[PDB]
Amino acid sequence: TASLSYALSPAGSRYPLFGTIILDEAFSRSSHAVAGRIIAALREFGLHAV
C-alpha cells in the first residue's frame, strides 16, 4: 500500500492522484484489531479504498 500510494502520487504531491484502490479478501486472514491496523495504515496513506 505504501509503495502504491507513493507511486500514484504525482510529482509535487505526496498523495496518490488515483485515490481509489480495490482489496479482495480484504481481511480474510486477520482479526478485527489487526484488520483495523490495515485500515488505519491504508486510509492514512491517502487511499480511497473498496
Add this chain to the structure above:
Amino acid sequence: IGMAREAGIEVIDSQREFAELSDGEGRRWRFNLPTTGLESQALMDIDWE
C-alpha cells in the same frame, strides 16, 4: 480470555467449573470454563483497535 492475556491478566486452567447460558435465538446450553478473573485496570491500560 484474549483480553486477559493481552493486557496481562493471566489465566489458569485445570478445573471443571460450569455455567448455563443461551445463544442468540433462545436455545440454551451448558458450558465448562477455565479459572481466571478479569480486571478493569489492566484492560483500560492496554489499547484496542
